[PDB]
Amino acid sequence: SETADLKSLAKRIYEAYLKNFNMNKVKARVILSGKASNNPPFVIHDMETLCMAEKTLVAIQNKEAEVRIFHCCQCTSVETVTELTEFAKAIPGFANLDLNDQVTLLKYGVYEAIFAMLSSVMNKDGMLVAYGNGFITREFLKSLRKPFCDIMEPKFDFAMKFNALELDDSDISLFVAAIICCGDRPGLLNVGHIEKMQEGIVHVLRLHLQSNHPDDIFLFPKLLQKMADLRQLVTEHAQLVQIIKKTESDAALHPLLQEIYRDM
Amino acid sequence: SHMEDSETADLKSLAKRIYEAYLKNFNMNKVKARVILSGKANNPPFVIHDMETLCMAEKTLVVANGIQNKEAEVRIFHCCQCTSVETVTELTEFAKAIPGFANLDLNDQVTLLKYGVYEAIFAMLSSVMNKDGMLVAYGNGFITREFLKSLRKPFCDIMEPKFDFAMKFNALELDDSDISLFVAAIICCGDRPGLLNVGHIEKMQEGIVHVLRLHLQSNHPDDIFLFPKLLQKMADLRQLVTEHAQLVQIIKKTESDAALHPLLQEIYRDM
Ligand SMILES: Cc1ccc(OC(=O)N(CC(=O)O)Cc2cccc(OCc3nc(-c4ccc(Cl)cc4)oc3C)c2)cc1
Numbered sequence: 001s002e003t004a005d006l007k008s009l010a011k012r013i014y015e016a017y018l019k020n021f022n023m024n025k026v027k028a029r030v031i032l033s034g035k036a037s038n039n040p041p042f043v044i045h046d047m048e049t050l051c052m053a054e055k056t057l058v059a060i061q062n063k064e065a066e067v068r069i070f071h072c073c074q075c076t077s078v079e080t081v082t083e084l085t086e087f088a089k090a091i092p093g094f095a096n097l098d099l100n101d102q103v104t105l106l107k108y109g110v111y112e113a114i115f116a117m118l119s120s121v122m123n124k125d126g127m128l129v130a131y132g133n134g135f136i137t138r139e140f141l142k143s144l145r146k147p148f149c150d151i152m153e154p155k156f157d158f159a160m161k162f163n164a165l166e167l168d169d170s171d172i173s174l175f176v177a178a179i180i181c182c183g184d185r186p187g188l189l190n191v192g193h194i195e196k197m198q199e200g201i202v203h204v205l206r207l208h209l210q211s212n213h214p215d216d217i218f219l220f221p222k223l224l225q226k227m228a229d230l231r232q233l234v235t236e237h238a239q240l241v242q243i244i245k246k247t248e249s250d251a252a253l254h255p256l257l258q259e260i261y262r263d264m
Numbered sequence: 265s266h267m268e269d270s271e272t273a274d275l276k277s278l279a280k281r282i283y284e285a286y287l288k289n290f291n292m293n294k295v296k297a298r299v300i301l302s303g304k305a306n307n308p309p310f311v312i313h314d315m316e317t318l319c320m321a322e323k324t325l326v327v328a329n330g331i332q333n334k335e336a337e338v339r340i341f342h343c344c345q346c347t348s349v350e351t352v353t354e355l356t357e358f359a360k361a362i363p364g365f366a367n368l369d370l371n372d373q374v375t376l377l378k379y380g381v382y383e384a385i386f387a388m389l390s391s392v393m394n395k396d397g398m399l400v401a402y403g404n405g406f407i408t409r410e411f412l413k414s415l416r417k418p419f420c421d422i423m424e425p426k427f428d429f430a431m432k433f434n435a436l437e438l439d440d441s442d443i444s445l446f447v448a449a450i451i452c453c454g455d456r457p458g459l460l461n462v463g464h465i466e467k468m469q470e471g472i473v474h475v476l477r478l479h480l481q482s483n484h485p486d487d488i489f490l491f492p493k494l495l496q497k498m499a500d501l502r503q504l505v506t507e508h509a510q511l512v513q514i515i516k517k518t519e520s521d522a523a524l525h526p527l528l529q530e531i532y533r534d535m
């Protein structure tokens with residue numbers, strides 16, 4: 001056989017994902033379903049609960065509510081960018097790429113990966129925040145003033161469709177690997193090397209989905225559509241963040257994130 | 265002499281709480297407005313100075329698809345009502361945060377805001393005005409004084425008196441900590457008609473005016489006559505609002521396609 005070398009590569013990527021991401025789907029669903037070791041998450045559903053959560057659950061406070069949330073979200077994405085970087089290094093072959101291509105892959109890959117994985121902590125009612133110890137409601141976010149109320153809703157729309165696919169962490173680990181090792185990105189020096197790397201990852205992904213989800217043999221095609229959906233979601237997100245930058249006085253953007261967004 | 269006693273600590277505490285309520289409840293304040301107006305903000309506000317720039321700004325800064333085919337004068341009137349309705353909501357929340365206000369009879373709270381909101385609106389509107397124009401659309405737009413004057417009657421006559429007031433008001437060089445107190449004093453006014461317990465409001469007023477006087481002396485120790493100058497401004501604001509109500513009534517009775525927001529009609533009712 002020649003399928004053992006791929007089933008091996010699958011486990012290895014899955015192990016790198018388990019090692020590198022504090023939050024994952026199994027952990028999130030244990031919390032969301034109420035099967036946690038201790039207490040249910042603190043629900044942030046209004047201005048009073050937000051203030052409570054700010055003092056109690058996370059380590060600025062002077063600003064408008066919308067800006068304070070915005071800053072909190074940037075703290076989370078900066079954390080996830082770091083985790084993704086480490087995960088990428090642990091993907092067999094990624095470290096052998098041209099140094100600049102490695103940077104370009106992560107620059108253009110991270111937000112697609114972020115929103116794919118964020119789905120794991122989202123349900124129709126809201127999402128986990130503060131290391132799984134908080135839950136901010138979807139309707140609270142929608143009750144904020146424009147343009148802040150428009151930011152997360154499209155992510156909820158994506159997540160609900162993404163979550164309908166009922167992927168587990170073994171599936172998501174490979175999907176995220178496929179997102180990062182993508183030959184389509186602009187400014188790539190060695191596209192050939194990346195295309196071949198991608199070919200390997202997408203092959204293990206298809207095979208893994210076929211073994212793990214025999215009840216839907218067309219899950220792989222469905223995931224490829226979600227991949228296209230993610231690019232558009234990220235394009236839109238970049239636009240929205242730039243509107244906040246061009247119209248909002250007290251809303252600052254973390255310098256690492258400024259750099260990621262730069263020259264998209 | 266002597267260390268500060270608990271009485272002045274209490275007055276200082278009240279001034280601080282009111283100032284805090286003001287920063288919390290008004291997105292646009294004087295410091296922020298002056299940063300934009302002095303060009304130290306970065307995206308320059310869109311300048312509205314003619315019919316073409318008005319059309320462009322309606323496409324980018326507002327989304328009223330119901331006003332698209334109306335006369336420019338009327339479209340602007342509609343946009344101004346959107347802003348005023350927003351400020352009336354902000355003022356209500358600000359008022360509920362003024363210590364003592366929540367303890368007033370409930371009907372008196374609504375009466376104070378009814379007769380107090382437009383004086384407060386035009387006082388605060390001075391913060392977003394200079395001699396050439398005013399910030400609109402949350403600081404993202406700037407409509408020129410000249411353009412407003414170029415509109416047909418009665419529409420050209422509405423904003424100009426406000427610009428005239430603002431120029432005089434702004435020459436006082438008040439900051440937000442002064443203005444928050446001024447607005448608190450406008451709202452908590454015993455001389456409004458139809459109050460159920462005037463005595464209660466007079467006691468509240470007296471307290472706020474005292475804090476205002478002392479804050480002004482501490483914040484502007486160079487200008488001891490600032491407090492009486494502000495009392496004069498309070499009278500000028502009352503007259504400005506009477507004039508505005510009248511001008512709006514002219515539009516109401518004479519204009520074919522100029523409608524009034526239902527909340528605004530209620531405010532203007534029996535003034
Ligand atoms: C209002 C608003 C503004 C911007 C938003 O989006 C972002 O800035 N980013 C970030 C980026 O673009 O890089 C996208 C993003 C990435 C990863 C996670 C994320 O959401 C995490 C989150 N965390 C909180 C939160 C945490 C603690 C408290 Cl006390 C309250 C809320 O709320 C939310 C939605 C958002 C979201 C909401």
Ligand SMILES: Cc1ccc(OC(=O)N(CC(=O)O)Cc2cccc(OCc3nc(-c4ccc(Cl)cc4)oc3C)c2)cc1
Binds near residue numbers: 343
């Ligand atoms: C022509 C005209 C008619 C009536 C006006 O006055 C009012 O309707 N009101 C309201 C009331 O009496 O309740 C007074 C008022 C209160 C608060 C703010 C305010 O002006 C804000 C403003 N906003 C615009 C504007 C915004 C976006 C675009 Cl695209 C174009 C213009 O222009 C202006 C002067 C006016 C002003 C101009």
